Design a protein around this ligand. Structure first.
Ligand SMILES: [Mg+2]
Ligand SMILES: [Mg+2]
Ligand SMILES: [Mg+2]
Ligand SMILES: [Mg+2]
Ligand SMILES: [Mg+2]
Ligand SMILES: [Mg+2]
Ligand SMILES: [Mg+2]
Ligand SMILES: [Mg+2]
Length: 115
RNA sequence: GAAGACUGGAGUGCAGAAGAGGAGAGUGGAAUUCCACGUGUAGCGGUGAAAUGCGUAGAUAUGUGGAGGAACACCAGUGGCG
């Protein structure tokens, strides 16, 4: 029940999700700006991410772990706010990874807005 | 108009070069979607704000595997070819 683990962060233009999992992708705890009581446009603010990271971090310590590897996805603004909340909860960030899925000119995207 | 002559036009020969020029056959890797199975809990998604929609019949997230189709990240350049 006590081990190491890795954290997945998905920061987009609407919401942020922090997923805390084992080395081989087995879920331990998660939280999101929606689950902290935010409803609409305020889901995406950096403050909402800072609470979301802390709530998952505290529930992570209950199982007991210290070292983390952080993977980052999405273009959201909560990348910086979320990671430093993990450190301020008493854990160590070993590495930072960017896993935004760039395609090699694959499927075409939805049309532009106001067209 | 007719009979001859020439090589600065035009074309052939000889030695090199570059190119996303065209048609046919086969193959590759990212990524999206769907399907099956682990972990897991209450939201996800979306907007100027919202709502319709999806989710406790267990979603979003995450790890593994399978199927299929379309376009070819960097190179890439008032660069190239017709
Ligand atoms: Mg859209
Ligand atoms: Mg000549
Ligand atoms: Mg060719
Ligand atoms: Mg061709
Ligand atoms: Mg693939
Ligand atoms: Mg209003
Ligand atoms: Mg899934
Ligand atoms: Mg020409």
């Amino acid at each position: 029940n006590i081990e190491s683990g890795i954290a997945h962060i998905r920061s987009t233009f609407n919401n942020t999700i922090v997923m805390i999992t084992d080395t081989h992708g087995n879920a331990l705890a998660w939280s999101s700006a929606g689950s902290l009581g935010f409803k609409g446009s305020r889901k995406s603010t950096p403050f909402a991410a800072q609470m979301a990271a802390e709530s998952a971090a505290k529930s992570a310590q209950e199982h007991g772990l210290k070292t983390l590897e952080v993977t980052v996805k999405g273009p959201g603004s909560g990348r910086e706010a979320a990671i430093r909340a993990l450190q301020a909860a008493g854990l160590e960030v070993t590495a930072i990874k960017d896993v935004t899925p760039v395609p090699h000119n694959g499927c075409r995207p939805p049309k532009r807005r106001r067209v």
